[PDB]
Amino acid sequence: MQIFVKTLTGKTITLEVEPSDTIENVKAKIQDKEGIPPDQQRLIFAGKQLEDXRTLSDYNIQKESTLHLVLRL
Q: Write down the domain spans for the chain.
A: 2-71
CATH number of this structure's domain 2-71: 3.10.20.90
How far from 28 is each of 8, 13, 21, 24, 37, CA to CA, in Å?
19, 14, 11, 6, 8
Resolution in A: 2.6
* Rg (the chain; Cα; Å): 11
Kind and range of the H or E element at 45? strand 41-45
Q: Are 50 and 17 in contact (CB under 8 A)?
A: no
CA separation for the pair 11, 18 (Å, rounded): 23
Question: Technique behind this structure?
Answer: X-ray
